[PDB]
């Protein structure tokens, strides 16, 4: 079935996957493209010298290990598989509570 085919593909992808190593661990740097969809800027406080903003922060890179050529559809997995992939260590330098 199509569901079993996709499950086999995903299991093959995540098998033998080292999360400690970024894509191209011994080669050129990986390119991470950023998008931000600012939902709102809530409060701009003069007493704390801060401002709260809610955003849809999106990153896009290219991992060659998560490449499949069996199914032709753009897979959308549960949000819990992100704990088993490598994701860039992005941080906001001037944040206080997020």
């Amino acid at each position: 079935s199509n569901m079993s085919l996709v499950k086999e593909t995903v299991d093959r992808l995540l098998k033998g996957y080292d999360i400690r190593l970024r894509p191209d661990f011994g080669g050129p740097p990986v390119a991470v493209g950023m998008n931000i969809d600012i939902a709102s800027i809530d409060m701009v406080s003069e007493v704390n010298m801060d401002y709260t903003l809610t955003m849809y922060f999106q990153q896009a890179w290219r991992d060659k290990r998560l490449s499949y050529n069996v199914i032709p559809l753009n897979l959308t997995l549960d949000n819990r598989v992100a704990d088993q992939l490598w994701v860039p260590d992005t941080y906001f330098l001037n944040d206080k509570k997020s």
Partner: protein, 50 residues
């Protein structure tokens, strides 16, 4: 009948992938929603929130 219920629940998640929605490539999932507001909280005017 605890044994039979455990064997049902074990057969139920045998080969289950919780990373694929039901009918991933063959259909569209249809989530039927409902809401029961137990308490409509205080509307804060300063934060424009509720």
């Amino acid at each position: 009948n605890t044994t039979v219920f455990t064997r049902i629940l074990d057969r139920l998640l045998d080969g289950y992938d919780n990373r694929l929605r039901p009918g991933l490539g063959e259909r569209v999932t249809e989530v039927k929603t409902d809401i029961f507001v137990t308490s409509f909280g205080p509307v804060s005017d300063h934060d424009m929130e509720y």
